[PDB]
């Protein structure tokens, strides 16, 4: 029968690792680097696009930074299509929670949910896991500003600064070196871009190879605003910080 052709995606190796999770992480290690940095007055999400031609329409393009609700965004590293499946599930969970309790979903609860979905693919069903790692940038009125990551295993953790995708080893050392707890958004913007500028496999870091976003409470009357940066704005912030 069919047993002959079954890869068995949900088994342990003799060492006690999940083959497909490990190989999915290997996939994600080749994806464009995404960085999240949490400041006292906001969060920065920066991410590097990949391959890019001069003919790619950048202003209508979204491969890295996605919006889950008005308070929570994600940076993606891995299969974009796999991410979009999970993103739309998350977007629904947030609205189910809003409908039930008449309050916006707390960031951790959303993150756990998605992470639990990812976990399920590693323990049952016989399907391949999602080849995606998320950085979640969000705000709620319990914990304030929060950064999390999840990976194909379904494990998630909280961070002050973090990278996913390519060159995370190098990126995490550079962040660990220059990050400080009293840091502000404008400084974190600069740190994020400087880290990508050194870890990039491209010759130089330009506006057309970047997606960029900030979650600031820095708004009138203490309300959270998500800013997905336009191509021209990423170009301006690259000149301001002195990279180009």
């Amino acid at each position: 029968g069919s047993r002959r052709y079954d890869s068995r995606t949900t088994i342990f190796s003799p060492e006690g690792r999940l083959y497909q999770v490990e190989y999915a992480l290997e996939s994600i290690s080749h994806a464009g680097t995404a960085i999240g940095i949490m400041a006292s007055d906001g969060i920065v999400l920066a991410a590097e696009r990949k391959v890019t031609s001069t003919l790619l329409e950048q202003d209508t393009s979204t491969e890295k930074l996605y919006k889950l609700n008005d308070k929570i965004a994600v940076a993606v590293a891995g299969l974009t299509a796999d991410a979009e499946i999970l993103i739309n599930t998350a977007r629904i969970h947030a609205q189910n929670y809003l409908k039930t309790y008449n309050e916006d979903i707390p960031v951790e609860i959303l993150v756990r949910r998605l992470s639990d979905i990812k976990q399920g693919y590693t323990q049952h069903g016989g399907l391949r896991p999602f080849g995606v790692s998320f950085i979640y940038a969000g705000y709620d009125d319990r914990y304030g500003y929060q950064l999390y990551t999840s990976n194909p295993s379904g494990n998630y953790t909280g961070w002050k600064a973090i990278s996913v995708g390519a060159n995370t080893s190098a990126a995490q050392t550079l962040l660990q070196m220059d990050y400080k707890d009293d840091m502000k958004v404008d400084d974190a913007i600069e740190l994020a871009l400087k880290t990508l500028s050194k870890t990039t496999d491209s010759s130089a870091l330009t506006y057309d190879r970047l997606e960029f976003a900030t979650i600031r409470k820095g708004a009138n009357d203490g309300e959270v605003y998500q800013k997905i940066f336009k191509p021209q704005e990423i170009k301006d912030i690259l000149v301001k910080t002195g990279i180009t």
């Binding site: 889950l68 977007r91 629904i92 609205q95 809003l98 409908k99 008449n102």
Partner: protein
């Protein structure tokens, strides 16, 4: 017994010159017993306003449902829903409960952000669209509102002329209905400002 007239209340909407107005009373009751005088029946999803009369549990449920749907719409489309599009969404959503309907009388109001055209619409409980330019009425004093609107209304009113028209239409209709009144709200909606006014009316 009749679900559309347990809780009571009304909504009316009108068009003017480069503006729309939508208004509602504030009553919620259990038939004869008045319970709340802070039960607003007008909601908004971006720049599109939705009034809903009828069974209050369904009014609440539908508001929550259209908030849900319009939020996902905005995330996917990367723009706020327009009145024309929303009207169709309401109709769809009502008709998918054709044989177990929401006991409601919805009313859409808003200005199309691109064309600038003032828009209103109304529905029966199963989603048939009343698509009239002049005015839309709904609730336990709908007959009363139809009469008031037909005699008071005229086209192309300026925002503060239209306010006086819709307010007098609501107030005088509500005062001839046992299950409407207990306060009232009037939204005057323009292309980039919305004025919300609470009206002084008799509290019986």
């Amino acid at each position: 017994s009749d679900p559309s007239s347990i809780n009571g209340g009304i909504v009316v909407a009108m068009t003017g010159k480069d503006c729309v107005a939508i208004a509602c009373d504030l009553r919620l009751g259990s038939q004869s017993l008045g319970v709340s005088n802070k039960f607003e029946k007008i909601f908004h999803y971006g720049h599109v306003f939705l009034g809903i009369t009828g069974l209050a549990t369904d009014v609440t449920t539908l508001n929550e449902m259209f908030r849900y749907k319009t939020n996902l719409y905005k995330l996917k489309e990367e723009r706020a829903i327009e009145p024309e599009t929303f009207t169709q969404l309401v109709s769809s959503s009502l008709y998918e409960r054709r044989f177990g309907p929401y006991f409601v009388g919805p009313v859409v109001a808003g200005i199309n952000s691109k064309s600038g055209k003032p828009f209103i619409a109304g529905f029966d409980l199963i989603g048939c669209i009343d698509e009239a330019k002049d005015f839309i009425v709904s609730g336990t004093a709908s007959d009363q509102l139809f009469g008031m609107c037909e005699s008071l209304y005229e086209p192309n009113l300026e925002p503060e002329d239209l306010f006086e028209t819709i307010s007098q239409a609501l107030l005088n209709a509500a005062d001839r209905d046992a299950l409407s009144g207990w306060g009232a709200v009037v939204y005057i909606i323009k292309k980039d400002e919305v004025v919300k006014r609470y009206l002084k009316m008799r509290q019986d």
